[PDB]
Amino acid sequence: AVVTAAGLAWLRQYLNPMGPDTTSVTGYPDGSAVTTCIADYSNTFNVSFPPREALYCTGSSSSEKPTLVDADNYAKIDKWSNYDITLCVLALPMLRNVVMLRLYPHTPTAFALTEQTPNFPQRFPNWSVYSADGTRFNNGDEPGYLQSYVYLPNVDKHLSAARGYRLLSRGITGIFSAPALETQGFVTACQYLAEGSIQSQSIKSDAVRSVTVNSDGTVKNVESSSQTVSSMPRYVFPLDGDNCAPSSLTETYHQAYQSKATDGFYMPVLSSSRDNPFHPPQPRAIAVYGSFLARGCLDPVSEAHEADGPTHDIYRLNVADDVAPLFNTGVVWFEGISPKFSLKLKTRTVLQYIPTSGSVLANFTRHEPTYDQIALDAADRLRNLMPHAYPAAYNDWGWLGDLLDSAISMLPGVGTVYNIAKPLIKPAWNWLGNKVSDFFGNPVARDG
Amino acid sequence: AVVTAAGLAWLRQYLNPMGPDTTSVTGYPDGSAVTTCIADYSNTFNVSFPPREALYCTGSSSSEKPTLVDADNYAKIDKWSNYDITLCVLALPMLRNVVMLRLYPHTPTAFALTEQTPNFPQRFPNWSVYSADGTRFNNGDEPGYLQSYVYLPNVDKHLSAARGYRLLSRGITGIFSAPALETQGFVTACQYLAEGSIQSQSIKSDAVRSVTVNSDGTVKNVESSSQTVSSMPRYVFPLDGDNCAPSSLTETYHQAYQSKATDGFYMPVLSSSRDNPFHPPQPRAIAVYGSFLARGCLDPVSEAHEADGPTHDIYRLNVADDVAPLFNTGVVWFEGISPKFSLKLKTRTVLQYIPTSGSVLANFTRHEPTYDQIALDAADRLRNLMPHAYPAAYNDWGWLGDLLDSAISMLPGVGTVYNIAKPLIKPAWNWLGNKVSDFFGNPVARDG
Amino acid sequence: AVVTAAGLAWLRQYLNPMGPDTTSVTGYPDGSAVTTCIADYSNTFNVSFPPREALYCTGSSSSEKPTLVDADNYAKIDKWSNYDITLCVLALPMLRNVVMLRLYPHTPTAFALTEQTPNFPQRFPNWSVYSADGTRFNNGDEPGYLQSYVYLPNVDKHLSAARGYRLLSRGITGIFSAPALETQGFVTACQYLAEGSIQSQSIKSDAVRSVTVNSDGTVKNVESSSQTVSSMPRYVFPLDGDNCAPSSLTETYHQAYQSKATDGFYMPVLSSSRDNPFHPPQPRAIAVYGSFLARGCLDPVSEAHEADGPTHDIYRLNVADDVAPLFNTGVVWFEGISPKFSLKLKTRTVLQYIPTSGSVLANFTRHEPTYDQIALDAADRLRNLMPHAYPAAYNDWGWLGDLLDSAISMLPGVGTVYNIAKPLIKPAWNWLGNKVSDFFGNPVARDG
Amino acid sequence: QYIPTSGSVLANFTRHEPTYDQIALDAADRLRNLMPHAYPAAYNDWGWLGDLLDSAISMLPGVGTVYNIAKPLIKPAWNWLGNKVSDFFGNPVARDG
Amino acid sequence: DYSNTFNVSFPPREALYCTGSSSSEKPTLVDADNYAKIDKWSNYDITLCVLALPMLRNVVMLRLYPHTPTAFALTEQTPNFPQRFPNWSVYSADGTRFNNGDEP
């Protein structure tokens, strides 16, 4: 009849993962009554303009040879360092490989992606270079942009020894800094769901074609195994590469966060479904869903073209992972950044495990099967109206909890005990103009 | 605590898609808070007995050659026109290709389906002929029935430029007419869920079998790639072809609508689940689930027959599409129709889109993130008791809305404000006998 | 506003499938309004130490030859009969093949499983032998353990003629007996969810490799169809074979039932989700999810190793079946059993069907579309706190129904009419110590 | 009705309701000779049936009578050709089809 | 509970078979285009009897006559391959089994 304390703790960490008050860790209030272990991974990364020693090439040059550094094409990347730059980060719902960093010389027209599978994508301290024409870069080409993945190794080790898992919350903070007199630049942020799913795409097989010139062997075996089969299953993410562009994100979403670069960002990525069931760890190769090339039977075709159906271009990331379903994909863009910047990424990912018997997690479990559907309904009705991102320093939201949770906790059905808490109005998040007001009209003075 | 106006509008269009009052268009009340574009496709088709110019053959004759018209076997189809005929329409949950029309000389024993993939299935104005023995028809065979698909091209164009979609409602009206003194015939209608799903079936590969008679080449490479693999994924629909027959539908379902032919029909197809999540457009080849031929490991078998597991016969429709899950499959049969009939199909399909950034839909969006779980519960408890179909002219249901929605809106949980609206009783839909009574016993006089 | 009688009947049969009062049969209270047939399969099996005539070998010996009995290696199995033994049963959610029996000479270190596909797994009256080293047993090896499946043929026959199905409840009783003065032994029991799912794993193809020594034929066709494709889809069950061991189950779960062997067991397997949608019968080969052997792209690899992604070892059971999703997997262990024991397994499985039109089930249907979300919520909040198993004779739970159902029926939301029923406390299930108390502290005297 | 054979398909659809009623059997025996042999195809759901006819005959068998008088019973006139049809209680039957 | 529905009408030639000695050891024999006589029947009004014996299988027996018969005749000679509903079997005018080239 009334929301529990565990429900409040879960809501607080789910909506404000990196808030200062959220020190303890709590699990999903579904009352599964199973013995679970809740892990909290906090990581920090001081990303900046990479030096030459941490910069590899993904072309066919480093194909069978391992990672190849740049053969002093680094002069061109210094030429990048002469001017302003752009810095995108893409937070896919992948459990490990939490974010993808990407550096551009100028604002890209659209979020391009290589068509050939890159060789040896690099974890964060190293980067990997791509040519300007959306192609893999070998030494001697003309570099277009840089990319890297931010990897959490402990998450991999724990996911190895776990029967099931589910993501509880994830937040990403972007403390930005630059030398004095070089603070110019903008920042944009947006979340959006991606109907990523396990998919296998149609491919064609190789058939031997023998015309036996042998004297005794006149078989002329032309057996045709060249039929249509399924590729290995891959997790495909439909991200709108054209609409992942800066301007498209800005105009598309009314909750898109925009501010000056020095404000940083803070994205508490949110789920998109009421229920959060457990899943077994099934790491699979990730891929990005292009635009379909063979229409196939989508038009009246002969009775033989039914095989090569509506297949799509698949951009293979050459990264294997298991993703948290129903969680939003986040993305921020830093535009016009001074080349000698310094971005302190701070990620906090809290997630639940069912430990495999006799595994390392089995000793750290905790038995608190709290059940609270009031909190679940509160989150369900709160998700659609929370902002997508906030400035870096805007933790410790006063309106959360005492007011917002209480204000929405009285809506659901007949589960209302307190008569009335507070009217709820439309917030106006204008970080550019400094006319920002919260969910109750109270102005937000700038703390930093 | 009380159902909103948006909830009422959504319920009204979901239960009565083609009602006269439902002029405006409203979205699903889940409060996804995303920027969506809601499209409303209304189409009309005056289907009748096709002339010879719009009648192609699906046999191996039109295999590599495109569509082939009938080489004046049309005399037999005129002989059909001498007697009465039967007209089935099958509304699968496919987004485009809204319905499948099918014409028979007499009532079929069962809803047969070709085993070989037909060549060039035809959109509505043209038809495609099939032989009597459930085989593809080449010129010179003996025609068994005709078939066609009703295609919406705008739906295809819009589904191209959309990150996600979900079907809001769909209704099909069947205004029937015939020359005076030839109004004889019956009509039957029924909806039923089909657990259609993405499936890939086991197939076998082709292996080269070389016995090298070459003098220097004595390899005799007999390498066996002839293993078991997966076909390309297809959307398989388990429709009960034996139980899609007329009599089986009549006896099976107590909500099956039956009437005289001149009454037409009006099927507001209904969902079968409470939630309606967004889905990315994934058009795939459609197929119908036959009866499994290789039992495989379903019986104690040798350790080598585990490969060819329980595979089923797959009837390939040679039509690629993406379907709306959790929506019922509808079917109506017109029996004993006069051959010179005239059926005005009127389809209305309203569905939501998430527009891809920079796409054509992005300019037509609308920002009304209404949330109303009362309406969702009302629909959930109303679905099981609505009739499957109504006569063609029975729009503007008085009992809907002011009474039925209100009567059921007070059931759910404690979300009840109004004390009591009206008792709810068992309706008796007897369109044959003219003893029809609605959900409150009020008789329904015949308006047409 | 108040839970119906149908809701009470469904809850009673779902939580106490083999209780004496549950004589009538009732369906899921979701109000699907469809015409359904509810079937109740009760089976009994007097399992004991098998004789030599019912004991086949699964090695390559019985590969193409059918089932091969043991060539009088039965002396070793008699030597087993000299000492104590261990008897595991594993109740997977498979519809047919309800349980897997397994006999060991002593307590196994872990629930091993053969890596090669066994030949002709045997239904219950016969068994199949496996070697000590987790390998298939041919005549002349050294036997390690015995295994068998308990098969329900009527379930197969009915599942053939059904458009859809869903499992309503399933219970397994273990009446144990042994000769006087040989009642020593322990019994342990545990349920746990398994995220079993349809999966296809990466495999590699066979390519012909021809160097044409033919005089006229100098093609040297070395065409490489040796690419990566998908195996046939299989239902993979992630069971923790290391944590399916006795001690791991005992320590892991606080609801694990433990007692003396003579007490038997009674496991009412429970679902793990609120909703229970219908599913079409899709029998597929079952397999057990090992530990992945090829990491693949989980580490930075060359642009060519993306194909052989994170593949797992797959233990193929050589048994095809369709499973009930969201139902727990149960397992009991009998330890130190006297070799001349007698276990009376009593299984009761009640499940719903949608009959295919014109099929055998179509005549036995029943039209009671009751809707009761109160009962669904009651089950949802009751699942996490019910014990995993009870002694064999502990049917007819007094606390169920009049108190427990009523006590929890007042929690959900505002759907509360009766003021207060009874306080609910923590039960203490200690069958070893005879200090057992139910959900209201009332002690449970031993009826047997 | 069937007595299922063990292991057969019928065995999964049994019903335990051994109800006993001499009154119903006696009423059926009494009424067998009164009901007409057939009706028009559309003439189901008779008003007189059950609450009226079965009741008004249920006291006749022996003296198994609790309610004193339910309803007098008269000979019907099933003149379907002449549209002059009257049921067991004289109530005219207007054409419903 | 078995509920069944059938749509009986004047059968086409493909659903008629001969009961005479023609299809004695041979399986059912379709009419050798004596169907013109049945069309002659279709010229005028017909008669349709159904006889519901207490048989569990074979719920009813349908029968079509050119014109009302004086009695429910039957053939002293056993018919060959009696036909389940969608197919019919023809009997001659003289109350005997019908081979092709007789008077139905």
Residue numbers in the entry:
A (entry chain D), B (entry chain D), C (entry chain D): 66 to 513
D (entry chain C): 417 to 513
E (entry chain C): 105 to 208
What did the article's authors report about this structure?
The RNA genome sizes of LSV1 and LSV2 are ~5.6 kb, encoding three major genes: the Orf1 with the unclear function, RdRP responsible for viral RNA replication, and the capsid protein (CP) for the host recognition and viral capsid assembly. CP forms the capsid shell that protects genomes and is responsible for both host specificity and receptor binding to transport the viral genome into infected host cells, or for intracellular trafficking. We determine cryo-EM structures of T = 4 and T = 3 capsids of virus-like particles (VLPs) of Lake Sinai virus (LSV) 2 and delta-N48 LSV1, belonging to tetraviruses, at resolutions of 2.3–2.6 Å in various pH environments. Analyses of these capsid structures reveal the intermolecular interactions that drive subunits assembly into homo-trimeric capsomeres and eventually into a complete viral capsid in which specific domains, such as the N-terminal domain, the helical domain, and the β-barrel domain/C-arm, could encapsidate nucleic acids.
The models of T = 4 and T = 3 LSV2 VLPs were built and refined with the homo-trimeric subunits A/B/C or D/D/D. Each icosahedral asymmetric unit (iASU) of the T = 4 particle consists of four subunits A, B, C, and D, whereas one iASU of the T = 3 particle comprises A, B, and C subunits with the C/C dimer taking up a position similar to the C/D dimer of T = 4 particles. Accordingly, the T = 4 LSV2 VLP is an icosahedral symmetrical sphere consisting of 240 copies of the 57-kDa full-length CP with 80 apparent trimeric spikes on the VLP surface, whereas the T = 3 LSV2 VLP is composed of 180 copies with 60 trimeric spikes. As a result, the T = 4 and T = 3 particle sizes of LSV2 VLP are variable, with diameters ranging from 494 to 482 Å and 450 to 438 Å, respectively, from alkaline (pH 8.5) to acidic (pH 6.5) conditions. In comparison to the expanded T = 4 and T = 3 particles at the neutral or basic pH condition, measurements of diameters of the shaped holes on the I5 and I2 axes of the unexpanded particles at pH 6.5 show that the minimum and maximum displacements were changed from ~5 to 4 Å and from ~22 to 15.5 Å, respectively. At a neutral or basic pH environment, homo-trimeric subunits A/B/C rotate along I5 axes; homo-trimeric subunits D/D/D raise around I2 axes, leading the iASU to pivot upward. In contrast, the basis of the quaternary change on the T = 4 and T = 3 particles at acidic pH is further flattened on the I2 and I3 axes, respectively, suggesting flattened hexameric capsomeres concomitantly result in a compact particle. Furthermore, the superimposition Cα of CPs between T = 4 and T = 3 LSV2 VLPs at a neutral (or basic) and acidic pH shows no obvious change.
